[PDB]
Amino acid sequence: MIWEQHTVTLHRAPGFGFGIAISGGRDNPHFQSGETSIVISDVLKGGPAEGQLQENDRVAMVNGVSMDNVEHAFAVQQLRKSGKNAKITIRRKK
């Protein structure tokens, strides 16, 4: 089995944010298995991330900051604090 890794720079659209929601984290595992990966849980239809990220995608980094085994509030924190641009590294189970 194989994962696929690439980076995207999401361009903020005021009123819409970066157009993604995330679940997962040290304290809020998305997975039955107990895996703590921060997970792309939704992409706003036609939003800043449409056609670039997908649901159940896994987040490794946000703005050069590793999302390895972090608390959920910490990942959100990194998105919120971005500028006009949020660089996001992902891993896809495809």
Domain residue limits, the chain: 1-94
- Report the C-alpha gap between 39 and 81 in whole angstroms: 18
Q: What residue type is 72 in one-letter code?
A: H
Q: What is the 3-state secondary structure (H, E, C) of 31-43?
A: CCCCCCCEEEEEE
Determination technique used:
X-ray
Q: Which residue's entry shows tokens 């972090």?
A: 70
- Report the C-alpha gap between 84 and 37 in whole angstroms: 25
- Report the C-alpha gap between 45 and 32 in whole angstroms: 27
DSSP 25: -
- Report the C-alpha gap between 44 and 61 in whole angstroms: 20
Query: CATH top-level class for 1-94?
Result: mainly beta
- Report the C-alpha gap between 25 and 72 in whole angstroms: 5
Residues 60 and 89: beta-carbon distance below 8 Å? yes
